Amino acid sequence: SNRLDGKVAIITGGTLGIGLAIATKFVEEGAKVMITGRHSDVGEKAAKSVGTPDQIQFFQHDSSDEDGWTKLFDATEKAFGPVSTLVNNAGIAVNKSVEETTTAEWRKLLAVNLDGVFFGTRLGIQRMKNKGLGASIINMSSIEGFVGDPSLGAYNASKGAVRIMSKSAALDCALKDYDVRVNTVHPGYIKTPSLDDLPGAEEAMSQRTKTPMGHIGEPNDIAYICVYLASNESKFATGSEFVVDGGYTAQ
Amino acid sequence: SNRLDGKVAIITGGTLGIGLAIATKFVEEGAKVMITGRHSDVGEKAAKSVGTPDQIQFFQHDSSDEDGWTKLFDATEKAFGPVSTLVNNAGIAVNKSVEETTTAEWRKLLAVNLDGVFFGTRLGIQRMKNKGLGASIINMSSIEGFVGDPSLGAYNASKGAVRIMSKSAALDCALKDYDVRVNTVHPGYIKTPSLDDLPGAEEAMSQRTKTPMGHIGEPNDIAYICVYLASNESKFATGSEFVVDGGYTAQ
Amino acid sequence: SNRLDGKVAIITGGTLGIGLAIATKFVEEGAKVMITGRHSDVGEKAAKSVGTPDQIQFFQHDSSDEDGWTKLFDATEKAFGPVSTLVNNAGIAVNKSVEETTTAEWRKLLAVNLDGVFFGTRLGIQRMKNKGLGASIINMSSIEGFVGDPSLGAYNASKGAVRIMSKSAALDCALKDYDVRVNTVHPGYIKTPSLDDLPGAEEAMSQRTKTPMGHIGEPNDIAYICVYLASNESKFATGSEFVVDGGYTAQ
Amino acid sequence: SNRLDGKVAIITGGTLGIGLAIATKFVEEGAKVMITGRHSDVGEKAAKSVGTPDQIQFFQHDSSDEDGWTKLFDATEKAFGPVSTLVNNAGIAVNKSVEETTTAEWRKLLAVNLDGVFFGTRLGIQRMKNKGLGASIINMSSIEGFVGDPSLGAYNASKGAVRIMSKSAALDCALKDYDVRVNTVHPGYIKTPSLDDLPGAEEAMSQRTKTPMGHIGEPNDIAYICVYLASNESKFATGSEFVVDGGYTAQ
Amino acid sequence: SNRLDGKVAIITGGTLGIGLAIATKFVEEGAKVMITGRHSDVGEKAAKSVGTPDQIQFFQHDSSDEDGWTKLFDATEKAFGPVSTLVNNAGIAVNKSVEETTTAEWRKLLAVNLDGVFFGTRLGIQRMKNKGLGASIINMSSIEGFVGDPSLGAYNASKGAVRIMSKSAALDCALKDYDVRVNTVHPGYIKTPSLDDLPGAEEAMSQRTKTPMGHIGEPNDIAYICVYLASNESKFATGSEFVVDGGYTAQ
Amino acid sequence: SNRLDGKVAIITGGTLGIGLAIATKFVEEGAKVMITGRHSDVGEKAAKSVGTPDQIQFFQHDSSDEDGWTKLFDATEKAFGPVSTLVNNAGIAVNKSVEETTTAEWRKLLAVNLDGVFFGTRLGIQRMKNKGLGASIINMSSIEGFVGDPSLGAYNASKGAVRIMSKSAALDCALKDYDVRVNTVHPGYIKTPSLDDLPGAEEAMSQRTKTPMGHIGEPNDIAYICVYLASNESKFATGSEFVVDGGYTAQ
Amino acid sequence: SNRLDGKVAIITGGTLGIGLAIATKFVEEGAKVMITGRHSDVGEKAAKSVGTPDQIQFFQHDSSDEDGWTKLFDATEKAFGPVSTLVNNAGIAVNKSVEETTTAEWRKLLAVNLDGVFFGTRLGIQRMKNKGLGASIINMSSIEGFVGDPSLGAYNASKGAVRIMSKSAALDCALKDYDVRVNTVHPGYIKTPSLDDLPGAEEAMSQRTKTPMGHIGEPNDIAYICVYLASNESKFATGSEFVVDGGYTAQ
Amino acid sequence: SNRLDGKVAIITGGTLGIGLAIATKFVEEGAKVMITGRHSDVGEKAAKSVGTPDQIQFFQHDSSDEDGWTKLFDATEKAFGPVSTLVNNAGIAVNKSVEETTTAEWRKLLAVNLDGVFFGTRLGIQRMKNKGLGASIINMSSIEGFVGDPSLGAYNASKGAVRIMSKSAALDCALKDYDVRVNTVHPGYIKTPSLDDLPGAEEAMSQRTKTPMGHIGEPNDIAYICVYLASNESKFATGSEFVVDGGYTAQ
Numbered sequence A, B, C, D, E, F, G, H: 001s002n003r004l005d006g007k008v009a010i011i012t013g014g015t016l017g018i019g020l021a022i023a024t025k026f027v028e029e030g031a032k033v034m035i036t037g038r039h040s041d042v043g044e045k046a047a048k049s050v051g052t053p054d055q056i057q058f059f060q061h062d063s064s065d066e067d068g069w070t071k072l073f074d075a076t077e078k079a080f081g082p083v084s085t086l087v088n089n090a091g092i093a094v095n096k097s098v099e100e101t102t103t104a105e106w107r108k109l110l111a112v113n114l115d116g117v118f119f120g121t122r123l124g125i126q127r128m129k130n131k132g133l134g135a136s137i138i139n140m141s142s143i144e145g146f147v148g149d150p151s152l153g154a155y156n157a158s159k160g161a162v163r164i165m166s167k168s169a170a171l172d173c174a175l176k177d178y179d180v181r182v183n184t185v186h187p188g189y190i191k192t193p194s195l196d197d198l199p200g201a202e203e204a205m206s207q208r209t210k211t212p213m214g215h216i217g218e219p220n221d222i223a224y225i226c227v228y229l230a231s232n233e234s235k236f237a238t239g240s241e242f243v244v245d246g247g248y249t250a251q
């Protein structure tokens, strides 16, 4: 324990599901955390349920709002000191094939899943570089950044852009000695509130033809791999992809 | 010869460089072609230099214009009959790291390199499916869809989105028996007019630490692989990536 | 036509299935060919069925026989002149998991699928370099060099070694200006005699959960991609992997 | 701490370099360990330097000795109880291109780097399955299982086989509910004694064109990622590849 | 009473403030109403507080979502029959001068105040024309569509676009005999929840130099003028502007 | 109904056309009315046709007679109690351009259309202020107070003066807390007897280039807008212009 | 310079304030001018102070004298040739609300501000039409022809009539091809002798709540806009209003 | 002449039509000018045809490109010194009713006609304020910012936003003593290259029912009014609208 001693972390969309589990384990390991979300009653209840205000707080912010990113970092710095860790987790999904995707659907999904991650990654580098913090940016992609799905058109493009954009960021901060690492995490199917939104997807993706283990994962499975990437145990890991999918992409 | 017997092809950005070479070899192999571009004097001169109006014509169209895509297909169908082949080639580049990319730069590059390819891929599936044409959509990505470059931030995201979005399209048309194939092509550094725009990039990317062959490629190197993917010799190839880079990604 | 003008090619295991199709299309495109195999009566009948002795001949040779490789190159050079093209095609498969694979089974498969390809690649570089031939070595891997299968343990290991060993050879001949290219081809499931070793594989791999097109391929699907790699159209392609699998690895 | 509570681990080649660091961190986290090697005086000194005989012991064994693998499991089970974790770490390297590799060199490297890993993986599945141990087999590959190097011919082939063979094992134990996970670790260049086999490799691979961070790693960088894969935090990770290379493969 | 006999109305942003007052008086006068909003708990409570489900219901919808507009009209038609009245009320404000407005602020405000009104006005004409319904589209502009305010830059542009765009719509449906009227409403300062968001604005805008009446208005003041424009008493009014501002624009 | 509960209204020129319709609807909504005119036999018949003497009565008075205005207010107050509402409606028109207007024509039209409205507005403020009546003065202007007509010279000037003079009165009664509101109504072309003064005006102004609806209005179209302005629903409306013209001024 | 080459202009009330400045700039730009006024000693001194008798002269005339208008045109034509330009500038103001305006005050102001402008506009059209002069009539209105003031009752009415009457004249001379243009100028508060009629108006109208620039204008500000309207640069401008008020009417 | 002595002006879209005429007259009056456009051959030819490089130059720039605005001002400052005048002229049109406007058409027109004008107005204020330059921003709206047209939906909204946004800018720079004036110009129909794009619109808009003068204007008609607004003759004019339309809006 205390594998994240002295760290200051922002976690976008950390009030439910995967992000909420990441926040819980981060606090358990010594970090001070700021979770974000769009609904404030859910968000404040989530922060209080994990710990005290000097351990974790909430900040209402839509990841696609460019102006909010500056206020988010200022607030976190004011409460806990300089930020050392960023988890770009907030994202959404659309159940459409490329052929049947409306232009409205296309723009709204990429505004969050791609533009938002770019806004945070870009400002994270500026604020955390050259400060001896052992900085780490963790961008949440997916197995849909490796393989395609016939009814996840815009989502496939979303996560593929994230996959390769982070490699470019990682190289720039390593060649320039910024003391910032960038890595991507690729979950399989995990039981979260948003997966209950796609009816019957859990049973379909628990078949052996899809997930060889015959079942899907839990939010803590993604939390543990991000503790590794946020801690100084991973000080030699940058620009790499980490897959936790129960065998999905192995076949 | 006549490996593309009876085919009807649209090639976006086919008035210079890589696209112009693709158009030349397509006509040489029996196809009827419509090249697009933004400058009309250059475009008409390019079409006439390759062949007669019953072999190839020009259509002024910005790939990021959504309304133009419908008029482009209607014009090509009126001149040559139903379209069977689409090459999503038009793209642009920005010499910026993720840290130093303005939001304006970000939006303009993705409007062409990602939104445009999506507009054509989406409408191509609708117009070419279920017609016995042996249809083929060829999306131009890059080696920057595999590896990152520290000063090609938005470009890396552009080509990564293209890489995985085409896999989703390929699966949807195969599971539904659409008679449409989708594949991506990943060139290395090729001597084109736009590469002279980035000063001294040719000599830098001809070092052995970058391109093991000690030199860069020519536009015909990309033309030949797209004749294969457009012809019926590749009738079992869909959702795959084809790299022609002189060894860049092998090390 | 005559895309392989003036080329001299060795094709191991060219008396059945994929190799016989490669040999057929090579002769049709102007090359002169020497196919190998272990049974000589089938082999002589195979050569005669494709063309006349001044177009194609047969040479009895076990791919795992190290000393025979020198006699194979000497015989082919004597009949047709200096060899310019090598296709390491001969291979076998066993339907066993890693847990239940005997050491005897393990050793015999790697002797053919790995040692044999190494014997040919090593001597091919020595014999074809620095002669202005536009030489090309094509090593036959598989989709099983990309993904795993629970009942193809030793076969998976063989084909993964071929995938990465060819990258090393390709880099060495490019950095040293040898005028030799090395590339790998990765077929999906193809209807050949070798499918009798995997009982029931055609029906099993024709499900949509396996091959999205709902069917498996034919030997000519692999022949056409090897015409491209053997011809000078691919003079900028080295160290790359080319997949023709009907969508198998895209999901 | 005690992230490896109650685990029993075998680490081949755990008397130097990476393996010794894995053994050190395993004991620190609660596991009981048996390290192997060929020289017994160094091995006994190595075990004693890490802890007491009830924490860690040594067993003289050549990874290529098939019969010794059964005695290795019997000895470890007798001292500590049933084995739950296996790290196939022992390996060697040779600085030779494919063109200039002797058959003797080829056979000896694959006997250790490939046959040895196969011997352990095969018997590990048999001995650890269906016992509620939360078993985990970690096979040591490399970045040379992803990209090629012009002077690592046989080493590239070895490590590529390990990469894809482990996927096959992982799928078999997940589809059959064996309670065994299989994953591979791919280190970059790490300062170990084994670097004396590649002369001048530290200075060569510390150029920015090779490792973007401008330096190579230390053995503890690989130890921490193997603690994650050996613990139950990774219970949803199987058949995956984890890269710790300082940015090497991102460009 | 029953001045709106038999009418079916959609009111965007009708769960608070001005829109909520419009909805209340509409139901009181015989109309059947569907109010929209982004927060569903507030929205459902608002609908129930005004009347029964056969008088008024709620529909969660962001006016800037183009796809939602079609579902909004379908839902209202399913519950109450064909829609006859549309009130484009939802809007937001930003306290910035033109000089100090960020591009992010600019785009977000116009996405709601201009794009949203255009989406509803465009689809309203298509759905309500040529059906004998006595249709009426009421677009909510402001006094800031007549005069400027030094710290309401984007808002001034928002409401000015609405003012003149509705004139074009009104003329098109009158020249074509569509039986659809379009008019704009221009409130002064009204005590609503969003006016409490701009601190001290109420006291500042209640000075006689600003509002000659020495006080600001109440939500019912805007409700009554929209009952007139929705009823058949205004059957000769189209393309006109109606100001209720307590004298603001008279001086 | 009873939207004008307890109100006492004077309507000049209420024996024909627009004024008679205003009087009719005023009584229907609870007000008690005194209509004026110059011919007494028509006037008495008009009053009786609308209702009983305790609802509406007639008073012979020329709007340009200054002394008669005091007797008009005294008579109305004696019959119904204190007056709360005034509609300055009486007016006439002449079909002449500025170039060909006689001074006699000029003086007579402004004596009625301007001097008369001034006489009533001035005395209305004096008599109705500071009595808690919710007083409202409605001055009848026209679209000819907004745009010009080449053959309505003197009429244009009259109606433009009314438009801006009422703004001045409205401001004075709001700054001084008089409890009196002043507003103007601007009708388009309405079918009344007064159209005999403009020969052929109905057919001329019913062209689409003039009134977009293709027809002119009826007197009730103006009556309804004056019910709103006379009732307490408009208690926040003062100094404003309300146009009911069938789209005339929108183009 | 000489922007008014060959023009002959009458300027009513050109012996003080705004008119004297218009006369000064007119002569400087080549026009020959006749200024009018009621006091002849001031008028003769004013003419002499601007230039010589062959450039500018004086004519004693009260703008409300109808018969004098014919002698004014005859005198000016005799001295300089046919008149081409008329500026209806003479006007007066009274500081009274509508409620407290005497009928005597009302009649005298409209006799000058309205009847006088009508007398000149009517005869100007008759005398200047159809002579190729490029004629231009400029009627002086005010911001008080746009907005109301609580203590400028009769003045507001005068200036509103001028605003709309000039539109009617402008249309008549354009539809009939008279070669006469009519336009209005609307000044803000300007420092002139006429400000003694509104006591304290300079300090009152220099507050930022009134004139945003914090000061009032000078007579030359109005002279320059009348040079444009009198010259042939404005040959496409007719029936329009030109405001020079320091921002007064923008808020 | 030299009414624009010592001024430095940027004119967007000044290579054709209205802007080209504005540039010509500006140079004639002493200003130094930088015209912008998208086509560089047309643009350079336009600059040279008006004057020498020390009088006028060209700068390729799309007004909708946000990044280009900073480079445009820097270039003009480098060639001529600090900029004092900005003319936001570049705009485009779409021939669609609100009902039949595609979302693509809507976004593209507003990107130029509204976003572009905002980009220049915002940066113009920052660069020209508080420098004693007598700065002037002239925004090109239209008569379609006053009245509507049934087939100019997006254009009507474009010009209405411009009309009211400039009022807000004018007030902010006057209240803060910025020495910057903002005004809008509203042309009628003018014969330009883009008006020949709408076939037969010239004859339709030259009818007396549309333009009372029976003809349309020429580019110089708009040039002259912008010389007035750019010169110090208009130092008291801010936040006002200037119409030159041949009587269009007067009826």
Ligand SMILES: [Mg+2]
Binding pocket: A107, A110, A111, B107, B110, B111
């Ligand atoms: Mg986008």
Ligand SMILES: [Mg+2]
Binding pocket: A147, A248, A249, A250, A251, C147, C248, C249, C250, C251
């Ligand atoms: Mg797969």
Ligand SMILES: [Mg+2]
Binding pocket: B147, B248, B249, B250, B251, D147, D248, D249, D250, D251
């Ligand atoms: Mg690399």
Ligand SMILES: [Mg+2]
Binding pocket: F147, F248, F249, F250, F251, H147, H248, H249, H250, H251
């Ligand atoms: Mg009009």
Ligand SMILES: [Mg+2]
Binding pocket: E147, E248, E249, E250, E251, G147, G248, G249, G250, G251
């Ligand atoms: Mg005002």
Ligand SMILES: [Mg+2]
Binding pocket: E107, E110, E111, H107, H110, H111
């Ligand atoms: Mg917009």
